[PDB]
Design a protein around this ligand. Structure first.
Ligand SMILES: [Zn+2]
Length: 37
């Protein structure tokens, strides 16, 4: 890790997908993992 630590986004609980720190826009991606419309 030579570079400088910066930008620590959140990691999806289902898959290894990163999204905005905290936002209701992510949850959507979650419900999708299950089978929501
Ligand atoms: Zn995911």
């Amino acid at each position: 890790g030579s570079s400088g630590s910066s930008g620590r986004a959140m990691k999806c609980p289902y898959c290894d997908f990163y999204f905005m720190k905290n936002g209701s826009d992510l949850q959507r991606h979650i419900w999708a993992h299950e089978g929501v419309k």
